[PDB]
Design a protein around this ligand. Structure first.
Ligand SMILES: *Cc1cccc(C*)c1
Ligand SMILES: *Cc1cccc(C*)c1
Ligand SMILES: *Cc1cccc(C*)c1
Ligand SMILES: *Cc1cccc(C*)c1
Ligand SMILES: *Cc1cccc(C*)c1
Ligand SMILES: *Cc1cccc(C*)c1
Ligand SMILES: *Cc1cccc(C*)c1
Ligand SMILES: *Cc1cccc(C*)c1
Ligand SMILES: *Cc1cccc(C*)c1
Ligand SMILES: *Cc1cccc(C*)c1
Ligand SMILES: *Cc1cccc(C*)c1
Ligand SMILES: *Cc1cccc(C*)c1
Ligand SMILES: *Cc1cccc(C*)c1
Ligand SMILES: *Cc1cccc(C*)c1
Ligand SMILES: *Cc1cccc(C*)c1
Lengths: 7, 21, 21, 21, 21, 21, 7, 7, 7, 7, 21, 21, 21, 21, 21, 7, 7, 7, 7, 7, 21, 21, 21, 21, 21, 7, 7, 7, 7, 7
């Protein structure tokens, strides 16, 4: 699972 | 994918999840 | 996908989930 | 998909879910 | 899809769910 | 993927998760 | 599952 | 399942 | 299932 | 099933 | 195929040959 | 195919040959 | 295939031959 | 295949031959 | 394959032959 | 070619 | 070609 | 070719 | 070729 | 080729 | 495509571009 | 493609570009 | 592709570009 | 690809570029 | 690839470039 | 785009 | 893009 | 891109 | 890119 | 890139 938080 | 001119801009997020291609 | 001129703009999110292509 | 000039604008979200192509 | 000039505007959401193409 | 001119811009994040290619 | 939170 | 929250 | 919440 | 809530 | 409640009975044979989905 | 309540009975044979879906 | 509640019964045979998905 | 609740019963045989996924 | 709750029953045989995933 | 013989 | 013989 | 014989 | 004989 | 004989 | 007896002649060109089948 | 009797002749060119099958 | 009797003739060129199968 | 009787003739060139199979 | 009876003829060139299989 | 020129 | 020139 | 020139 | 020149 | 020249 790709979990990316942008700022 | 052939001849792809991918030019991301400012703050662009692209996610390709489990491609086969 | 052939000859794709992908030029994302500011703050653009594209998600391709399990493509076959 | 051939000859696609994809130019996302400001705050544009595109989701392609399980394409075959 | 051939020769598609996709130019999303401000705050535009496009979802393509399980296309065959 | 053949003949890909990938030119990331400023602050661009690309994630390719488990491709087959 | 892709879980992305933008700002 | 793609779960994206925009702002 | 695509679950997107915009703002 | 696409479940999108706009604002 | 989405939200399929497949409940085979007694002695039921189902064959799906080369689907694309 | 969405929301399919497939409940095969006794001795039922279903064959789907090369679907696209 | 998403959200598939596959509940095979007694003596049920399912064969999926060369799917693409 | 996402969110598959596969619950085989008594004496159930499932064969998936050369899937791509 | 993501989020698969595979719960085989009594005497269940599953064969996956040359998947790509 | 699917060749199934039932009993 | 689907060739099914039922009993 | 799927060749299944049921009983 | 899948060749399954059930009983 | 998958060759399975069940009982 | 099933049971296709393709017998090209002299100087015959056939092009199938991105079929799904 | 099943049971294809492909018998190219003299000087026959066949091109299949990105099939899915 | 199953049961393909491919018998190229004299000076026959076949090109399969990025198949999925 | 299963049960392929590939019998190239005189001066036959076959090119398979990045197959997945 | 299973059960492939590959019998090249006189002066036959076959090239398989980056297969996955 | 298929671009074929015949002779 | 398939670009074939025949003679 | 497949670029084939025949003679 | 496959570039084949035949004679 | 496959570059084959036949004669
Ligand atoms: C065109 C393309 C982009 C990202 C991943 C793949 C496999 C293909
Ligand atoms: C045209 C394209 C974009 C992203 C992924 C694929 C497989 C293809
Ligand atoms: C035209 C296109 C856009 C995104 C994904 C695919 C497979 C194709
Ligand atoms: C024209 C097009 C847009 C998005 C997806 C596909 C497969 C095609
Ligand atoms: C075109 C491409 C980008 C990233 C990964 C792969 C396998 C292919
Ligand atoms: C709904 C469904 C059943 C079996 C195979 C596929 C690809 C889809
Ligand atoms: C509804 C449905 C049943 C079996 C196969 C497909 C692709 C769809
Ligand atoms: C829904 C489904 C069942 C079996 C195989 C696939 C690829 C998909
Ligand atoms: C849903 C699913 C079942 C078995 C195999 C695959 C690749 C997918
Ligand atoms: C969902 C799944 C089951 C078995 C094998 C694969 C590659 C995937
Ligand atoms: C019948 C047929 C010819 C060429 C390509 C396909 C997928 C099918
Ligand atoms: C019938 C057929 C010919 C060439 C390629 C494919 C995938 C299928
Ligand atoms: C039938 C066939 C010919 C060439 C390549 C593939 C994947 C399939
Ligand atoms: C049938 C076949 C021929 C060449 C390559 C592959 C992967 C399959
Ligand atoms: C059938 C086949 C021929 C050549 C290479 C592969 C991986 C498969």
């Amino acid at each position: 699972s790709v979990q990316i938080v942008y700022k | 994918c052939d001849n792809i001119k991918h030019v991301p801009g400012g703050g662009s997020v692209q996610i390709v999840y489990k491609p086969v291609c």
